[PDB]
Write an enzyme that holds these catalytic residues in place. Structure first.
Site, PDB file in Angstrom:
ATOM      1  N   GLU D  13       0.845  -1.183   0.000  1.00 44.20           N
ATOM      2  CA  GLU D  13       0.000   0.000   0.000  1.00 44.20           C
ATOM      3  C   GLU D  13       0.882   1.236   0.000  1.00 44.20           C
ATOM      4  O   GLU D  13       1.802   1.355   0.829  1.00 44.20           O
ATOM      5  CB  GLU D  13      -0.918   0.019   1.221  1.00 44.20           C
ATOM      6  CG  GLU D  13      -2.006   1.124   1.151  1.00 44.20           C
ATOM      7  CD  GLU D  13      -1.481   2.548   1.231  1.00 44.20           C
ATOM      8  OE1 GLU D  13      -0.451   2.769   1.919  1.00 44.20           O
ATOM      9  OE2 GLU D  13      -2.065   3.460   0.588  1.00 44.20           O
ATOM     10  N   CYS D  60      -6.001   4.971   5.956  1.00 39.28           N
ATOM     11  CA  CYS D  60      -5.725   3.820   5.102  1.00 39.28           C
ATOM     12  C   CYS D  60      -6.976   3.003   4.772  1.00 39.28           C
ATOM     13  O   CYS D  60      -7.803   2.728   5.651  1.00 39.28           O
ATOM     14  CB  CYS D  60      -4.709   2.901   5.769  1.00 39.28           C
ATOM     15  SG  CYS D  60      -4.121   1.579   4.715  1.00 39.28           S
ATOM     16  N   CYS D  63      -5.813  -1.272   5.392  1.00 37.70           N
ATOM     17  CA  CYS D  63      -6.173  -1.545   6.778  1.00 37.70           C
ATOM     18  C   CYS D  63      -7.324  -0.652   7.201  1.00 37.70           C
ATOM     19  O   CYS D  63      -7.305   0.036   8.228  1.00 37.70           O
ATOM     20  CB  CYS D  63      -4.978  -1.434   7.714  1.00 37.70           C
ATOM     21  SG  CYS D  63      -4.216   0.180   7.848  1.00 37.70           S
ATOM     22  N   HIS D  67      -7.953   2.252  11.974  1.00 42.94           N
ATOM     23  CA  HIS D  67      -7.808   3.602  12.499  1.00 42.94           C
ATOM     24  C   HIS D  67      -9.114   4.134  13.048  1.00 42.94           C
ATOM     25  O   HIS D  67      -9.103   4.966  13.961  1.00 42.94           O
ATOM     26  CB  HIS D  67      -7.295   4.514  11.378  1.00 42.94           C
ATOM     27  CG  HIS D  67      -5.899   4.186  10.980  1.00 42.94           C
ATOM     28  ND1 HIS D  67      -4.816   4.536  11.749  1.00 42.94           N
ATOM     29  CD2 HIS D  67      -5.416   3.513   9.920  1.00 42.94           C
ATOM     30  CE1 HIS D  67      -3.714   4.092  11.172  1.00 42.94           C
ATOM     31  NE2 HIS D  67      -4.054   3.455  10.070  1.00 42.94           N
ATOM     32  N   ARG D 478      -0.778  -5.212  10.655  1.00 40.01           N
ATOM     33  CA  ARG D 478       0.648  -4.946  10.541  1.00 40.01           C
ATOM     34  C   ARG D 478       1.323  -4.670  11.871  1.00 40.01           C
ATOM     35  O   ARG D 478       2.540  -4.436  11.892  1.00 40.01           O
ATOM     36  CB  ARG D 478       0.834  -3.796   9.563  1.00 40.01           C
ATOM     37  CG  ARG D 478       0.513  -4.230   8.127  1.00 40.01           C
ATOM     38  CD  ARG D 478       0.216  -3.084   7.147  1.00 40.01           C
ATOM     39  NE  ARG D 478      -0.277  -3.605   5.867  1.00 40.01           N
ATOM     40  CZ  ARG D 478      -1.507  -4.064   5.663  1.00 40.01           C
ATOM     41  NH1 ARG D 478      -2.457  -3.903   6.558  1.00 40.01           N
ATOM     42  NH2 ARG D 478      -1.779  -4.701   4.535  1.00 40.01           N
ATOM     43  N   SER D 501       3.419   0.392  10.569  1.00 41.47           N
ATOM     44  CA  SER D 501       4.425   0.599   9.539  1.00 41.47           C
ATOM     45  C   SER D 501       5.325   1.797   9.833  1.00 41.47           C
ATOM     46  O   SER D 501       6.421   1.856   9.268  1.00 41.47           O
ATOM     47  CB  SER D 501       3.785   0.725   8.167  1.00 41.47           C
ATOM     48  OG  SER D 501       3.200  -0.520   7.760  1.00 41.47           O
ATOM     49  N   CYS D 545       2.620  -0.536   4.561  1.00 37.79           N
ATOM     50  CA  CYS D 545       1.507   0.343   4.256  1.00 37.79           C
ATOM     51  C   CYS D 545       1.991   1.756   4.527  1.00 37.79           C
ATOM     52  O   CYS D 545       2.165   2.159   5.687  1.00 37.79           O
ATOM     53  CB  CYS D 545       0.331  -0.013   5.127  1.00 37.79           C
ATOM     54  SG  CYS D 545      -1.139   0.942   4.715  1.00 37.79           S
ATOM     55  N   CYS D 548      -0.448   4.402   5.938  1.00 36.26           N
ATOM     56  CA  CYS D 548      -0.345   4.203   7.382  1.00 36.26           C
ATOM     57  C   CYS D 548       0.936   4.796   7.961  1.00 36.26           C
ATOM     58  O   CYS D 548       0.908   5.470   8.997  1.00 36.26           O
ATOM     59  CB  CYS D 548      -0.379   2.710   7.674  1.00 36.26           C
ATOM     60  SG  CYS D 548      -2.027   2.092   7.864  1.00 36.26           S
TER      61      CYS D 548
END
Ligand code: SF4
Ligand code: SF4
Ligand code: SF4
Ligand code: SF4
Ligand code: FCO
Ligand code: FCO
Ligand code: F3S
Ligand code: F3S
Ligand SMILES: [Cl-]
Ligand SMILES: [Mg+2]
Ligand SMILES: [Mg+2]
Ligand SMILES: [Mg+2]
Ligand SMILES: [Mg+2]
Ligand code: NI
Ligand code: NI
Lengths: 551, 268, 268, 551
Positions: D13, D60, D63, D67, D478, D501, D545, D548
């Site tokens: 991503e 994101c 994912c 969030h 992640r 990330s 990502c 992220c």
């Protein structure tokens, strides 16, 4: 002789009783009886012609769609309405997808357990079973691992002691001929079939508004609003969704249902030599594609005394020779008026007086065509297409025969199709050819909308005086269907449905002649008269629908 | 584990109510019969026929007395002493009353068994009546529609199995999760109704914009159901009005099969 | 046969617009890339990376000059000479303008590329703008939402392929089949709005009966979209209001990401 | 020796650049760079705390959900709100189903083409390929017929000359080690994976209102209205539908994804000896099940210097030891304030000045835990569960090892898990264990509703004066995610996201210490510096990502 009764016959639609006299283990005479009546013809009378289709669709929920479509065609015939071509495409997609679900369910859920022994399946070697299909099918769900999972599902059900729909089945009956491995193949395919028929009905639902019982027709066309650019109507996104389900049907139909039909035939070759119900066959053309209720994709016709070479083509739903030949008698049925009646002049006057072997014994009427008994349905439909020289039908039959030949070393001749297994084969051939109907009509619809034609409905006018008559023909999953409407002073003054299972299941007629179910059973061997599986095998091959037969 | 038993008897049925199960997805019909319940009697799917299936019924009625759900589709014809539906030589009403004696719960699936439906319409040739009318001493759970969305039935059965009692019912013994509101009181074309944006004929401009179908005869204003929310077939967006055709009132006694398609509904 | 080429470039994207394709069913993403189109550039799925994938892009821009559909997700940041999005050492705005030169059609998928979206909200730290703002002499087809139902995009591409031109567009260049009507003008809870049947807090009695969400902040009255009809994920019945939460206006410039969740909408 | 740049890194991503110095055919030094910034922390500042989750969910879309959930947890932390248990069950089902989709797509769509050569798959014998999986998998879609259909799809794509996503892939590279047959297996599973991930997201959608970007959360619980008897709300029919999709995920996860993980390890065993990114690991407990934001189904903790035996458990999202240790630096990032900052005191002031090897070279900040670099994500998560003695994790890893043992005759020890393949294994183990999370939390929800608890939401109050600090932890696909919210005078005065990330991809830190991506690349053999496949293999194992990482 010995006298048996099979009541209820299960794994059909509706309420059927079959009686047989048996002489030395062979059926010598049979009686077919529809044991439930509703009077749907009388219920729909005295209403606006436009209302009929929603009511008479409820003749049957197995063959949902069919009576709705025949009813609107009948009113359009009476009124002299030409249906918009987009409405034809949509009607056609619905009927073809419906029939795909219908036939798949008949072969698997209704019929397979006449031929397949689940106890034997539990003894199968799943790897040997998968190996049997190498070079016979390219289906992606024939692995040993698939078959082991299916085997374990059966094992668990039997172990529970709650056999449910499988309880007291004909396991170990002497007429069960499949090896364990083929029994397991068939059970795996029975379960896989349920996904394919669900996808077929997703096609139906997206155009019909739901299924069972579609709700998108009208006298004059359809209620779908075609607008590629409209929110909440039949736009390109919705059409793409329809197409996504159409595309999911072919692989199972071609690599599973078609193959299993050949496999069953290969293990039951004596069933090519019994179950002949008639020497005359009728089908109507189907899937009109022009702007004037014609140009059918499938041909129709009339075969007499099994002579394909001299059959009579039927290319129009207004064919006067077809219309004039159809009559029904109630001599051996529980109605009052017994002489043969043309349906525009038909009555349906109940006169129940109990069962009599030589008198009245059924709620089904006895239809004839110019005085003859006639078989309708997939065997008739396939034979007519072969008589017409339809290459697609001959090629599809040839594919089934090639699989059968690989398994047995023998070919199949047309004479062997006048039989229980030939009737099953004709249904499979129909289901296979219907997939091309679906692709053809989806493409036709997309192309026509692209030309700027978004028309779907021609509003009828119904004169408030006068008396006029219409007939709507339809080649249903079980055969030629016709609805006959008389309008007088703007309302329905007569309504008569002559339904394919009426043709096949009707009792002895005005001349005491024997119709297809009863004729087909003469000569059936019955190993165990308490468990007459052989009789049910032949009867199931006609795909009985007694809500249809009797209405 | 053992599965809860179900006995299904069809009277004057078109089989559309059984066929609804073949469209279901939660559960699918195969998972219904292999995992959710034990379907101890159902003539459409039964391997056994004739004397063998009548033995299955008798055995199940005994083994599961007090425990099975009895389901009936189709109306029950009382005219002429029951002869308009005869199974194994006896009137269907007798089979139904016998099976009802031992039932833990009794469900009328479809408008025919719930209130007579199409088979009891017009002149009513057979004197067709509802399941509740033939079982006056029992509480019949009504799941109307022609046929209903199968999950209106399946989630009712699931509530019985999972929580040990029927779902909450309205004063017609219909489950409120499915029948608690008029279709017009939860219909996505209500804004068009409110604004006077109406289709006048199929294929007209308003029809092709998805406008309200009241003036085509929509019976949503007088029909209780979940057709606009649950809809049908689990593909999204599929119910009669969304496809372009008025509701006919098939759920609702006195509406479906009595009023004409294009006859206008009363609006509260 | 050969398939129509597509070049997809992400700017200030969260990847949710690409991810919408993984929920699509007509076509599924695998049928999209194997049967419907040739996806000539898409960094999320491409086997090649780095110099090899920049080779793919330049080869495709030349081979398919005048023929490909260009798709952009995310906003384009113009502040400080474009450095808030740099790919292969160059501002994404330059990659987009180069690709736009040879495009047969240009699509802004998602609110970010359609109108700046969340990335341009508040103080707009990066000077994020829409694709149309970066390409003033080109007609950009806008498919807003955060992310849109993927078929709002896929049926637009299909219309181009099948009929040789874009679908009909509104005055914001949004396809009318998907954005032609306010959500509130085709919302199944409108009857409740009309009757004053409102949820006041999540979990209250009216909320638990599926009443209108206006007083929770529903932005349906000021948001164009198809969320109440096409809905999401093709399972049936799934959109934010049907699940119990107000529309936030994510499709609509000035609504989503600007107004608070519970701020009330203006009603026309 | 020479310097290479990989820009863009694809099959992640977002926007990532990797630079490497190569000396004597091995990477000697690397730089990881996030090349896109949006300023999401600034966009959400000064708003009502209740609005943040809908905005910051847009950090994101890969994912998605994560969030949103971390944001509501952060506001709930600041405000001292205990979430209703039904809201926990729903949040948990969403996160677990989302993560199932996420991991499947990572292994197949994002990572497989680092290890799988489609050209070689065209040379495979489909029957030999199917035979290789006997006694390794019971999956029902490994037949030769399935593999032949897949092979023909590849063949047709290649024949068209339009390779699209497959064009200029690393076919024939010397680091591609799979036999033709295993390449074909992997491509078949790549396609099958797309169906399983779609079913996972149908679970998410039915509770979230859609996906990507759910819309059912609130500060105080969820927006789903629980009412078994209600029309249009979360009733038993809707719950049953959710369950139908939950049940569809296990077989693919267990019989395909888990097995392929072992298969890749078996053919690439040197990849158990490289790709170590860190010696410290962090995870937070996840899936709370009590009425007070705790009682997690999965455990968390901190491992220092790879010593599982002396790890520190973390059982609470309010653990002050966890909270106080977390800081971020921007010394080598394009922000102004460079000293390590605790996130409640964080700033995000852009200060782009171009790339410098020894200065600033990324939009990613550099997180530390008590001054140390830490790897987060599936490897951390697995190692912590093993340190905790979680039997389910031990047993699931042992299943993968047993397949590896059958294929190679060798075993795997924990020391070999600190590697590129160990990281992949930790992700597969997580996906497998998540299927039991789904079953557990569906059942808990049904049971709790049956007790009469339909509560889902506690309305918050937000004092109009005072300063309140909250932190929302979440164990994302992640790794450990945290959102840090400061409320002052009723509005968000600071918002800082520290994303998994960020931990792994962040550049050299305040003390010039190297983060996990950059560390993991030291020692990587690179056969062809123009086509650095080996570098991308290790980077992809972290599932980058960058939306992220940078936000
Ligand atoms: S309710 Fe409708 S579908 Fe069900 S039996 Fe009656 S007519 Fe058939
Ligand atoms: S009349 Fe029918 S279409 Fe119009 S709003 Fe009411 S229920 Fe909906
Ligand atoms: S429109 Fe929404 S989903 Fe699409 S890139 Fe922007 S934030 Fe992501
Ligand atoms: S305010 Fe929202 S929930 Fe209420 S009717 Fe309008 S769009 Fe529907
Ligand atoms: N097919 C079908 Fe039903 C019958 N027989 C009708 O028409
Ligand atoms: N998983 C995930 Fe996205 C990252 N890194 C978050 O949080
Ligand atoms: S006709 Fe029946 S199916 Fe629903 S839309 Fe009306 S109640
Ligand atoms: S928030 Fe967006 S997804 Fe639809 S319901 Fe409202 S426009
Ligand atoms: Cl149009
Ligand atoms: Mg002649
Ligand atoms: Mg008749
Ligand atoms: Mg409260
Ligand atoms: Mg941050
Ligand atoms: Ni029928
Ligand atoms: Ni992410």
């Amino acid at each position: 002789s010995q006298r048996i009764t099979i009541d209820p016959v299960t794994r059909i639609e509706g309420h059927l009783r079959i009686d047989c006299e048996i002489e030395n283990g062979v059926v010598s005479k049979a009686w077919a009886s529809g044991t439930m009546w509703r009077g749907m013809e009388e219920i729909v009378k005295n209403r606006d012609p436009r209302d009929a289709w929603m009511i008479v669709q409820r003749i049957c929920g197995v063959c949902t769609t069919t009576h709705a479509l025949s009813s609107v065609r009948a009113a359009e015939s009476a009124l002299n309405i030409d249906v918009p071509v987009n409405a034809q495409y949509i009607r056609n997609i619905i009927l073809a997808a419906h029939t795909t679900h219908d036939h798949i369910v008949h072969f698997y859920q209704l019929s397979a357990l006449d031929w397949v022994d689940i106890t034997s399946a539990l003894q199968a070697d799943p790897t040997k079973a998968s190996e049997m299909l190498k070079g016979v099918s390219t289906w992606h769900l024939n692995s040993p691992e698939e078959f082991t999972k299916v085997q374990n599902k059966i094992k668990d059900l039997v172990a529970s002691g709650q056999l449910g729909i499988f309880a007291n089945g004909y396991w170990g009956h002497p007429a069960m001929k499949l090896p364990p491995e083929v029994n397991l193949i068939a059970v795996a395919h029975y379960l896989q079939a349920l996904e394919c028929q669900r996808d077929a009905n997703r096609v139906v639902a997206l155009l019909g508004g739901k299924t069972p019982h579609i709700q998108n027709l009208a006298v004059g066309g359809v209620a779908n609003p075609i607008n590629l650019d409209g929110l909440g109507v039949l736009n390109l996104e919705r059409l793409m969704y329809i197409k996504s389900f159409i595309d999911k049907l072919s692989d199972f139909v071609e690599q599973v249902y078609k193959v299993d039909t050949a496999v069953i035939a290969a293990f039951y070759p004596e069933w090519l030599t019994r179950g002949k119900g008639a020497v005359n066959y009728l089908s109507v053309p189907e899937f009109p594609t022009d702007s004037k209720n014609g140009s059918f994709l499938f041909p129709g016709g009339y075969i007499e005394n099994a002579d394909l070479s001299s059959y009579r083509p039927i290319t129009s739903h207004s064919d006067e020779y077809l219309i004039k030949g159809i009559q029904e008698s109630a001599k051996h049925s529980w109605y009052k008026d017994e002489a043969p009646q043309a349906p525009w002049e038909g009555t349906t006057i109940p006169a129940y007086d109990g069962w009599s072997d030589d008198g009245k014994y059924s709620w089904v009427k006895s239809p004839t065509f110019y005085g003859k008994t006639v078989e309708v349905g997939p065997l008739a439909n396939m034979l007519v297409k072969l008589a017409a020289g339809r290459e697609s039908t001959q090629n599809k039959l040839n594919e089934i025969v090639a699989i059968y030949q690989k398994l047995t070393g023998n070919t199949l001749e047309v004479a062997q199709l006048h039989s229980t297994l030939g009737r099953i084969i004709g249904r499979t051939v129909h289901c296979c050819e219907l997939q091309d109907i679906l692709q053809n009509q989806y493409s036709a619809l997309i192309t026509n909308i692209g030309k700027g034609d978004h028309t779907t409905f021609v509003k009828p006018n119904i004169p408030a005086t006068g008396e006029f008559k219409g007939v709507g023909f339809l080649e249903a999953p079980r055969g030629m269907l016709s609805h006959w409407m008389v309008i007088k002073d703007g309302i329905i003054s007569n309504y008569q449905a002559v339904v394919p299972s009426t043709w096949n299941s009707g009792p002895r007629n005005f001349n005491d002649d024997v119709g297809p179910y009863e004729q087909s059973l003469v000569g059936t061997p019955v190993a165990d008269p308490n468990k007459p599986l052989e009789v049910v095998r032949t009867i199931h091959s006609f795909d009985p629908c007694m809500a249809c037969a009797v209405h | 584990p053992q599965r809860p038993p179900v006995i299904w008897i069809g009277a004057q049925e078109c089989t559309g109510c059984t066929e609804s199960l073949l469209r279901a997805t939660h559960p699918t019909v195969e998972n219904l019969v292999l995992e959710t319940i034990s379907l101890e009697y159902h003539e459409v799917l039964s391997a056994a026929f004739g004397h063998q299936v009548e033995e299955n019924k008798h055995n199940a009625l005994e083994k599961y007395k007090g425990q099975y759900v009895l389901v009936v589709d189709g109306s029950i014809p009382l005219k002429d002493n029951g002869i308009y539906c005869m199974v194994a030589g006896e009137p269907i009403v007798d089979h139904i009353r016998k099976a009802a004696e031992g039932a833990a719960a009794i469900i009328a699936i479809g408008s025919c068994s719930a209130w007579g439906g199409v088979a009891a319409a017009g002149v009513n040739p057979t004197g067709a009546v509802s399941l509740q009318e033939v079982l006056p001493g029992k509480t019949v759970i009504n799941i109307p529609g022609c046929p209903p969305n199968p999950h209106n039935f399946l989630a009712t059965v699931a509530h019985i199995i999972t929580y040990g009692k029927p779902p909450k019912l309205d004063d017609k013994n219909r489950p409120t999760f499915a029948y608690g509101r008029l279709i017009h009181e939860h219909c996505e074309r209500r804004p068009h109704f409110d604004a006077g944006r109406f289709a006048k004929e199929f294929g007209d401009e308003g029809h092709r914009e998805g406008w309200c179908l009241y003036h085509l005869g929509c019976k949503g204003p007088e029909t209780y159901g979940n057709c606009s929310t649950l809809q049908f077939c689990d593909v999204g967006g599929v119910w009669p009005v969304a496809i372009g055709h008025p509701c006919y009132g098939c759920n609702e006694e006195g509406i479906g099969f009595h009023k004409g398609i294009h006859q206008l509904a009363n609006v509260e």
